[PDB]
DNA sequence: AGGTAGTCACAGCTGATTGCGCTGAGGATTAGACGTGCGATATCTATGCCA
């Protein structure tokens, strides 16, 4: 595997949703290790069984 | 007074019902590092050998 230098990687740009589109990654969803990873026009409710309504 | 259409009492057809199966979301769940122990291994110098 190839790691890469900090100097060699930009800073990740969370995308921003269009058309009331959340974007999705290859696993279909959006990694969110930090706040800033966020795509703008987003927001996270952390409300038990929310996605079942 | 006479017969077949309107009305009521029952029959076939079919949809709803009641046991039972299956997915989708949702909440549960020892491999380079860091050292040492042992083992092979460079490493420095006393000092008397005889020319």
């Given at each position: 595997?190839?790691l890469?230098?900090?100097?060699?990687?930009?800073?990740?740009?969370?995308?921003?949703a269009?058309?009331?589109?959340?974007?999705?990654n290859?696993?279909?969803?959006v990694?969110?290790f930090?706040?800033?990873?966020?795509?703008?026009?987003?927001?996270?409710?952390?409300?038990?069984?929310?996605?079942?309504?």
């Amino acid at each position: 595997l190839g790691l890469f230098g900090y100097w060699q990687t930009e800073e990740y740009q969370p995308p921003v949703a269009v058309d009331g589109k959340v974007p999705r990654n290859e696993f279909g969803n959006v990694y969110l290790f930090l706040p800033s990873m966020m795509p703008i026009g987003c927001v996270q409710l952390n409300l038990p069984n929310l996605h079942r309504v």
